[model samples]
Target chain A: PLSIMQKSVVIRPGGRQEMDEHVAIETPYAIALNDRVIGSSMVLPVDLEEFGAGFLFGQGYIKKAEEIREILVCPQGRISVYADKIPKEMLEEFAPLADYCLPFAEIKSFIREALHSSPLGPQTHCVHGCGLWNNGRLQVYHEDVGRHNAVDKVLGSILLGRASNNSAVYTTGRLTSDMVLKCARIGIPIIMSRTSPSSLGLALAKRSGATLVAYSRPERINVFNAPERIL
Target chain B: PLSIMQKSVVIRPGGRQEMDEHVAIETPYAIALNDRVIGSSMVLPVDLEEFGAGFLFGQGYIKKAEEIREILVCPQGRISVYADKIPKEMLEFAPLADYCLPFAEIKSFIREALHSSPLGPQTHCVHGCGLWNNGRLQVYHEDVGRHNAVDKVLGSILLGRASNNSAVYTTGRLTSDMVLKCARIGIPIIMSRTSPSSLGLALAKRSGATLVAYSRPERINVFNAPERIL
Candidate 1:
C-alpha cells in the first residue's frame, strides 16, 4: 500500500473551479544507523524498513545482506537499522550482466507492467514508480515522490531476501548517474527506465557491465550497452 | 560537455534502429566555504558560481551574497566561497502579507519564460526556473537538479536584483524545502508547472506565501494565500 492524501485544489483558467484531488504525501524519515542518526529525507512512508535497509546499503554502508541484523520501525514509521557497520571500502560496479531470452513483445509487456504498477503514478502523476523482477515474477513494486526513495524501496526489498539473484529493476525516473551507480554497485544485472538517460548513466552502464534500458514504453524500448543480450 | 552529448543505442520493436542520440550531462560538484568543503552533490556542470552562492545562502550558512567576498571556482567541480563567518543556522521563515500576480500576467510570464532556456527542450532532463519581477522574467536558471535550479535563481536575490515584489516560476514540484527556501529568500509568490506536496501547501499557507501549481497557459491553480494571485 502507498501513502496518499486527498486535498481540495483550485483549478484555474478563470473558472476558479475547485476540485478534490489526491496528492502524494512527502515527509522526512530520519534514518539511524545503530545508535547514530545518519540522514533523513522527505519520502513516501511505506515499506520503511526496506527504506532504511536499502538506503543504508546503497550509501556504502553495509555490503552483505547478513550484515544487516535487524530493522526497527517506530510509531512514526521511521527506521533504524541494527547491524554491522563495515563500510564498502571500494565501490564494485560490475557483476555478471543479465541475459533475456524473451522476445520484443515479451519485453514490452514487462515494461508496461512496471509502468502501470503504481496507483499513485497513474492517479496523481506526481510519484515515481519502481518494480523488481526476478525469476519470472514481480517481486516488489513501490512508489515515492522522490525517485531515489522509490528505487531504494525496491533495492531494500532485494537486500531483505526478496530474491537472491537474476534481478532486473525498472523505474519511472530518468536514468542518471546516481540511480545507475547505485544499482551498478549493487550488482543489479539490468537497469531499466521509462525516461531519458544521462550521458554519464550510459557511460556508467557500459563500463559497469550492466544492461541499460530507457525510454521504455509498451510500444517500444530502447536498449543501451547490452541490447545484444536480448535474444 | 555542459549540456548534451551523442551516444549510440538500439531502438526497439523488432528491428534495431541503431543511431546516435543526445543525452544530458550529469556530474558531481562540491561547494566549499572559506576553503572548507561543506557539501557535494550531482548537477549539470553549468553556472558553478551561482550554484555555490545559492546553495550557501539557502542552507542558512550566510545571510547575503555581500558576505561572500570571493568565489574561486576550482580546477574540477569544486566551488569555494570565502566568507567572514559561517553560521549554519536554521532560521524560521516569516509569513509575508504582500505580493500578488494577476492571473493573466502570470500566463504571459510563463509563455516567455518557457522559451528562455535553449537546453530544456534539447536534453529534457534539466529543470528550469525564472524570476518574475513586475511582469517580467529578470533572471533564469536551468539545472539537472530542480532544487539546484531554484537555488541558481535565488542567488540573484543576494545581489539585490530580485525584489520582494517578485515571484518565482519552476518546472519542479512544490515541496516543503523548496517553499521554505523561497520564504526565507523573501520571494512572496511561488509557482510551478507540477504538483505541490501536501506539506508544501501547508507551509505556503502558514508562511502566507502564494502557492501556484499546475500552471499552463490557460490554468494556474492558486493553492494558498490566494490574495497574492490577483
Candidate 2:
C-alpha cells in the first residue's frame, strides 16, 4: 500500500556509485467478519485468528477472547468473524477510541528483538521492521523494503479478522501521527517503538486517550499519556 | 523535545571508508492557553504560538478563530494562549471524537494532492505551505521546512489577524485527518496542496468543498467541489 526505496553508496575499484532501487510485492492476507467487510488492511497474512483475538483485547473492545463466536478467512483478502452481539451505540463509541489501545509496548520489544536478536543488525544495518503482537508476544515480524507497508501488513491481519479493536502493534519506523492513527483506528492501545513520537502524534494520542510508550531501549521507556497504566 | 540532525557523509580517499557526522540540538517548546501551560511539545522551537493554536485546531477543541484569546511567547521557548472561555465541557472533549464532525472530503483531497504533486515525487522533498485567498486573487503563500508546522503557523496567523474564511489554504503534505481538522476549524472554503491523497481529495470535492491539487508546473488541478474557482 506504500512505496520503498534503497539508496546507498557503492565502492568499485576506481570510483564510488550511488545506487537506488524500488520494488512492489504482496504478502498473505484475509478479511473475515460474519461474512461482511467491517474493514480490511494489508498484512504479513498469517496467524489471523490470534491476530483477531489479541487485536480485540488490545483495543479494549473485548476483555475476553472467548467472546468471538467464529473467524474465517475468505479467498479474496477478506476475513469474517462472528462475535457476541455488540450494541450499535457501543460499537460507535468504541470505534473512534480503537486507535488508542494497540499493543504498543510489545510490538516495540518484538521489533528490537527481531532486528537485533541475531546477526541481522550487524549484517545489514540498513533495514527497518513492522511487526504484530498478541498478549505480549511477537506473532509476526517482517523486515520490509518500506516501513509503512510493513505496518500495513500487520494491520491487515487485524482488519481481516475483524479485530482492530484490541491488539498491539510495533514498528521500527518514525512515530508519525499517520502511523499512530493507523493503529488507533484498529483499537491498538499500547504502541511501542524504537523511535520517538511526533508532536502531532503525541497530541493526537493525548486527545484520543491512547497510551504511547516510546524509546524502548533496553533499560528505559518513555510513557506519553496515561503513564499509570504501564506495568 | 525531538532532535533534528544535520548530517553529511565524508569519504576517505584511497579506501572504501565513509564516515557520517551528526549534531543534535534541543528545541524546547511549551504550549500555553491564556498564559497557562496546557501543553508543551518538543518541536524545532521556531514558532511556539503557532504550534499551540495549530494543535488546538487539529484536536477540534476551538471551533472558530475568535475563540483564541491571546498567544504569548517567551524567549526561553514557552508559548501560551489566552482563551479562558473555551468551556470545560469542550476541554472534556480534548481529543475524543465521538461528536466531532468528520473532516471527510477535505481530508481526501489532501491525500490526492500528495500523490500527484511534483515536489514529493520528483525530489523526495518535504514542504509545508499556507494558502490565503480573496475571491479575485490568491494571497499569502509561504513554504517551510516542515509541512505540518507550516499549516500550524498559518492557522495561527489566520486566528490572530482574522482572515476571511472564504479563502483557500494549500500545502505539499499528505492529506491526513489532522490536516483536515485545520481546514474545518479555519472555515476556509478550500485548503489544499498539490501532494495529497485519493481519499482526501475525493472527500473534499464531494462535499461542495473548494478543492485543488496536482499542482504540476504550469497547471493546477481543481476538483468537482471548487467549480466556482476555475
Top candidate, metric DockQ: 1
How well does candidate 1 score on lDDT at residue A207?
85
lDDT of 2 at B51: 62
Q: Model 1, which residues run further than 4 Å from truth?
A: A1-13, A85-103, B85-92, B95-97
Model 2: how far is A113 from its true place, Å? 23
lDDT of 1 by residue, B117-195 (tens): 7777776788888888667888888888888898888777775656656888999998777787787777888999988
Task: State each model's C-alpha RMSD to the native.
Answer: 3.0, 15.1
Residue lDDT tens for model 1, A1-231 = 344555445756546666666666877677889968887777877778888888897776776788888999885746889988112343233665445333455566677677766667656657887887755667688888888888888778878886533677888898887788777776776788887788878788888888788777766667877775555
Candidate 1's TM-score? 0.92
Model 1, position B197, has a per-residue lDDT of: 81
Off by over 4 Å in 2: A1-231, B1-30, B34-42, B74-78, B85-126, B134-147, B150-154, B162-179, B186-199
lDDT tens string, model 2, B25-131?
22446666655565544444444566667666655455566787777778687777666411223211122111111123333334443443343332222344433
